[PDB]
Ligand binder design. Sequence first.
Ligand SMILES: COc1ccc(S(=O)(=O)N(CC(C)C)C[C@@H](O)[C@H](Cc2ccccc2)NC(=O)O[C@H]2CO[C@H]3O[C@@H]4OCC[C@@H]4[C@H]32)cc1
Ligand SMILES: [Cl-]
Ligand SMILES: [Cl-]
Ligand SMILES: [Cl-]
Ligand SMILES: [Cl-]
Ligand SMILES: [Cl-]
Ligand SMILES: [Cl-]
Ligand code: NA
Ligand code: NA
Lengths: 99, 99
Amino acid sequence: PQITLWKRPLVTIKIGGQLKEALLDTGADDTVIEEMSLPGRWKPKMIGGVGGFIKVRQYDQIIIEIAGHKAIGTVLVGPTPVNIIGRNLLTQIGATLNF
Amino acid sequence: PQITLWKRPLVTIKIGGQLKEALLDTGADDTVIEEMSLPGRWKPKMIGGVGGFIKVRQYDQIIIEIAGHKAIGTVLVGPTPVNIIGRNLLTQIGATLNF
Ligand SMILES: COc1ccc(S(=O)(=O)N(CC(C)C)C[C@@H](O)[C@H](Cc2ccccc2)NC(=O)O[C@H]2CO[C@H]3O[C@@H]4OCC[C@@H]4[C@H]32)cc1
Ligand SMILES: [Cl-]
Ligand SMILES: [Cl-]
Ligand SMILES: [Cl-]
Ligand SMILES: [Cl-]
Ligand SMILES: [Cl-]
Ligand SMILES: [Cl-]
Ligand code: NA
Ligand code: NA
């Protein structure tokens, strides 16, 4: 698809057997999801953004389905105000910015 | 252009006769740049993201060139960690997300 930017570019994702709404976010290096359980190992991380840092759990090798397209990568879990799909997974679904 | 996301989507912007680097950010509703002087009156705004909220100065109808494309619109100025071009100006330069 081609997604215009008049509105927030929200898509449905499937992660950890759950459906969620998430923002396609080219300004995010990393994918950050609100609190949920994920299987396997994790390690703590701090991530920054506009208003300072939050502490998250970093899970590697997580499969996600993004608007129908499967991808695998690192997912950060913690108190983000918005579920964000960052570049680490946008690349895997072949997303580009065009103008 | 078509911009892939393996790297941060940084472009050159020109505002007040000055070149700066900024992130093309589909996850940002608005454009936020680091402290600088802009002409005219400003209005208060609070914006929020990953680690909470910041106060910014809202300047309307500011001339800004983005990757060679001319825009005129609202620019927020404040203690953002990075210059961000949000959807209010991405729409003015014709940007879409494609996959
Ligand atoms: C109303 O208008 C707005 C309101 C909010 C914002 S924002 O900057 O807070 N943000 C909103 C989004 C979280 C819902 C836009 C994001 O694209 C920011 C944009 C952003 C980039 C860098 C620093 C601050 C903000 N990215 C971000 O938080 O990324 C996180 C996740 O991955 C890392 O990549 C980034 O680079 C490393 C740190 C951040 C980490 C911008 C304009
Ligand atoms: Cl919206
Ligand atoms: Cl979707
Ligand atoms: Cl990854
Ligand atoms: Cl590619
Ligand atoms: Cl980079
Ligand atoms: Cl505007
Ligand atoms: Na893992
Ligand atoms: Na003005």
